[PDB]
Amino acid sequence: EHTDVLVLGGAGVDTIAYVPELPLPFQDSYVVAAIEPRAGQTGDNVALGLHTLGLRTMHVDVLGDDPEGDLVRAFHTRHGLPFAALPTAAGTKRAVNLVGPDGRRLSLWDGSREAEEDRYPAALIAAHTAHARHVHVCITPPGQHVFGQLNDLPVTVSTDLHNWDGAYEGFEVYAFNADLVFLSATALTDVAATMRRVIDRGRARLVVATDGAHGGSVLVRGETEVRRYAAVAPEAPVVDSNGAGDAFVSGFLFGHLAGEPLETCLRYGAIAGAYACTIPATRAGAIDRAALLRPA
Amino acid sequence: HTDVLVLGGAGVDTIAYVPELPLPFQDSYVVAAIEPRAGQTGDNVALGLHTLGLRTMHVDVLGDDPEGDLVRAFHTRHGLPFAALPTAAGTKRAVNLVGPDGRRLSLWDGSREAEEDRYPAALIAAHTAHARHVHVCITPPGQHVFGQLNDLPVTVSTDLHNWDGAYEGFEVYAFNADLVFLSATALTDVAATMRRVIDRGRARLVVATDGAHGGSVLVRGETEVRRYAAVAPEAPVVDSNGAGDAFVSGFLFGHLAGEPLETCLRYGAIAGAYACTIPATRAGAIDRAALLR
Ligand SMILES: C[C@H]1O[C@H](O[C@H]2[C@H](O)[C@@H](O)[C@@H](O[C@H]3[C@H](O)[C@@H](O)[C@@H](O)O[C@@H]3CO)O[C@@H]2CO)[C@H](O)[C@@H](O)[C@@H]1N[C@H]1C=C(CO)[C@@H](O)[C@H](O)[C@H]1O
Ligand SMILES: C[C@H]1O[C@H](O[C@H]2[C@H](O)[C@@H](O)[C@@H](O[C@H]3[C@H](O)[C@@H](O)[C@@H](O)O[C@@H]3CO)O[C@@H]2CO)[C@H](O)[C@@H](O)[C@@H]1N[C@H]1C=C(CO)[C@@H](O)[C@H](O)[C@H]1O
Ligand SMILES: Nc1ncnc2c1ncn2[C@@H]1O[C@H](COP(=O)(O)OP(=O)(O)NP(=O)(O)O)[C@@H](O)[C@H]1O
Ligand SMILES: Nc1ncnc2c1ncn2[C@@H]1O[C@H](COP(=O)(O)OP(=O)(O)NP(=O)(O)O)[C@@H](O)[C@H]1O
Ligand SMILES: [Mn+2]
Ligand SMILES: [Mn+2]
Ligand code: NA
Ligand code: NA
């Protein structure tokens, strides 16, 4: 009856423009397809994905009194996602993304959408974790202040560092206080080294470094060699690779909370990620339980 | 009341400031504030003419959009008389990448058109009764309005923007306007395109802007194209979006005031230079005082 998985942060709005190619050669203007601001940033996708897979999720994030804020509220209402909007003077998180015909995405992340005085109230975290098994913390503020509290709780914690430097100190509090750490490998100087470093802090059981259509790589606590997983071919054209890594997290966690072995969890993630690559910005979509369990 | 009737061009730009154009491929950049704003070609011309002290009226189709909200708020805030016609296609919109030098890569939404849309003749006739001039933006249903305008006692201007000089859809605008403005960025043969507007159309003069290099003008009855020089902005160049529209505003302010061609060209250059100094975080147009000295 209560929250099974608490999702912290990551609520926002992407404005997608489909472009002929990336990098886009300079002109005064291109005529593009329909431009339509939608909710569905990393916190929105992890929530939707987990909920579509049948888990009782709660989603909490700071939210502006914005037209962007309206979109996020409507997103959760539309997909039946339990949601708590916290006030903030900074405004709702935004990005402008350029999507190529191959599904590749160039995100322009608004970095002004932070108020240092924002906090996820301790009582709210406590209320939604009273019977919960897992908390996913998005790397958006004020997520950096929540791990003193979560570390004392009988729940597992996961995070997604996305295109982490491997060096940028800001993501460390996330990377070093999470049992399951996810991240992309596109901005890593040394993938293997970053993965080993996250493990050498003595908290994470595994690290996953995703590599798009190549699948990705994983490192398990106490193991020396990194493992790979294969990407799954989508049953539809790759249109928009936005939310794939979030879909991967959702799929993986579904298997994690169901006691599945690592390889199955990785399989779930890959299938969910491939599905997400086939969804336009014109609709919101997350893979369903039945389809996730369909391949062998 | 009204001096100038502005038709079309009501829309919303979403600006993202980027380190360089063209933008090399990365998964993500961290950029400054992204804040959708009203102020496409029609909104800017209206505000420019209004700021300079002319009596304006702006008419365009508008969607029951969040974008529509921004547009309506814009006209109210700046006190621009405005009449929104309903449309099912939605409010026009673009995503613009703006570099540190003010250069802009616009991403125009070409889906915001409904073929059944029309400017109602009775609304057109009503606002052309006392108007001396009508400016028609090249957005639909603009292409259906020149039959009525042709029989009215008003001068007509238009702005063709980054026209091919070949795309047939703009020809109805280019060939039925007293004053034809356009950008020269996409022109293979600037001079030929200008003369073609003179010969096939009824333009009394044609202006092909060229950004910081000024632009080109061709006058009916003359053989050679003239040049005008750009004026340096008096504040840092931030966002060149709206420069061309400001040029039209400054030019018309003098044109409707019977000022010589050289004076009108100069006003536009100043107005356009000023336009490049306004952020996407503010709406701004040059006033009478700053323009006249
Ligand atoms: C979710 C988001 O995470 C990442 O964004 C982080 C930045 O990369 C960090 O640099 C940091 O931003 C700070 C600035 O660096 C700093 O100058 C200051 O302005 O404060 C900023 C915020 O504290 O932290 C950011 C997160 O808070 C990543 O780069 C970004 O791409 C990620 N968003 C993507 C996710 C999805 C779907 O998964 C899309 O909806 C978005 O469009 C993507 O941009
Ligand atoms: C005002 C706008 O004019 C120009 O846009 C025109 C396109 O260039 C044409 O191709 C045509 O678009 C049609 C498509 O070609 C067609 O495939 C179909 O999708 O229908 C479309 C609409 O009929 O007509 C367009 C005008 O509606 C120009 O390219 C564009 O850049 C101009 N907009 C700029 C104006 C300003 C200055 O303030 C900025 O606000 C905008 O961001 C600029 O993009
Ligand atoms: N083009 C593709 N074809 C097939 N599978 C894909 C493709 N792109 C991604 N995937 C799968 O989805 C996973 C996530 O992709 P990836 O691009 O690495 O995530 P991401 O960049 O973090 N997406 P996001 O949630 O928007 O930050 C990969 O590990 C693959 O399993
Ligand atoms: N950087 C600049 N410095 C000085 N004057 C400028 C600058 N950029 C533009 N101008 C002036 O503004 C005029 C119009 O600029 P231009 O870029 O040609 O119009 P535009 O691109 O169509 N703007 P827009 O309304 O967004 O379509 C030029 O002829 C100059 O007089
Ligand atoms: Mn990611
Ligand atoms: Mn223009
Ligand atoms: Na997608
Ligand atoms: Na500007």
Curated annotation (Swiss-Prot), chain A:
GO molecular function: kinase activity
Disulfide bond residue pairs: none
The keyword Acetylation is annotated on this UniProt entry: no
Top-level division of the source organism's lineage: Bacteria
Xref: InterPro entries: Carboh/pur_kinase_PfkB_CS (IPR002173), PfkB_dom (IPR011611), Ribokinase-like (IPR029056)
Annotated EC: 2.7.1.187
Keywords assigned by UniProt, alphabetized: Kinase, Transferase
Catalytic activity: acarbose + ATP = acarbose 7(IV)-phosphate + ADP + H(+)
Assigned protein family: Belongs to the carbohydrate kinase PfkB family.
Function: Catalyzes the phosphorylation of the alpha-glucosidase inhibitor acarbose. Phosphorylation of acarbose could be a resistance-like self-protection mechanism.
PANTHER family in UniProt: RIBOKINASE (PTHR10584:SF166), SUGAR KINASE (PTHR10584)
Protein name: Acarbose 7(IV)-phosphotransferase
Species per Swiss-Prot/TrEMBL record: Actinoplanes sp. (strain ATCC 31044 / CBS 674.73 / SE50/110)
The gene coding this protein: acbK
